[PDB]
């Protein structure tokens, strides 16, 4: 399995 959840805002900057 896998817990990752790719949310678009996480791929912006600054973190």
């Amino acid at each position, epitope marked *: *399995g*896998n*817990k990752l*959840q*790719v*949310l*678009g*805002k996480d*791929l*912006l900057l600054p973190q």
Partner: antibody
Amino acid sequence: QVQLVQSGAEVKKPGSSVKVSCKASGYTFSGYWMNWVRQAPGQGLEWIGQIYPGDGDTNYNGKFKGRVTITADKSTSTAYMELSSLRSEDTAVYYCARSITTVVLDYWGQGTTVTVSS
Amino acid sequence: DIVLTQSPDSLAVSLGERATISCRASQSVSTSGYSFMHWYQQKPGQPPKLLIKYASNLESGVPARFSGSGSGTDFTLTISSLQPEDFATYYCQHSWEMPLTFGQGTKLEIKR
């Protein structure tokens, strides 16, 4: 053969609590986020919250925080949603749905009708 | 909270013709060349079914007459050569942030 099977229709009076079940089959229940999505006429689809059954982490819609509790039993592979202080606006069909790492809901239960009325 | 507004609310289109359904987000949901918007199909008595992921990527088994497009705030689902099984309610969903939100749905009906 992912299958999500929900508990049966429920009828409740205002102010009560309802607890819907969702039995999963064919995947590692502990490793996928389980969401609650409700559907009432004219109200589109509403994402209630989610729980990651592995470690019990939860994320809620602020519209419902402090009124809904989402839980998960790993031994029975069952997720739950308690909607407390029910009101005549919570009448809806309640779905459970498995989601994947790209945050789409790829398998859905058959839905549970919840009627709240005096 | 992101608000998704679809247009139209309902649409009647003849068999064999082309339907266009729109979803507008209250903020951009695109970054790095990917749009975090998805489409579902729902028929009465059934849960929604995932049709298109990331605005334009058809799920397995979805016929080629379906397509999706758009970026930023505006997205479109298009079905050419409509078949009887295509008449349904369609919902958009973003995966930009928590909480996940959905469009209010567009009901596609048969024009006769």
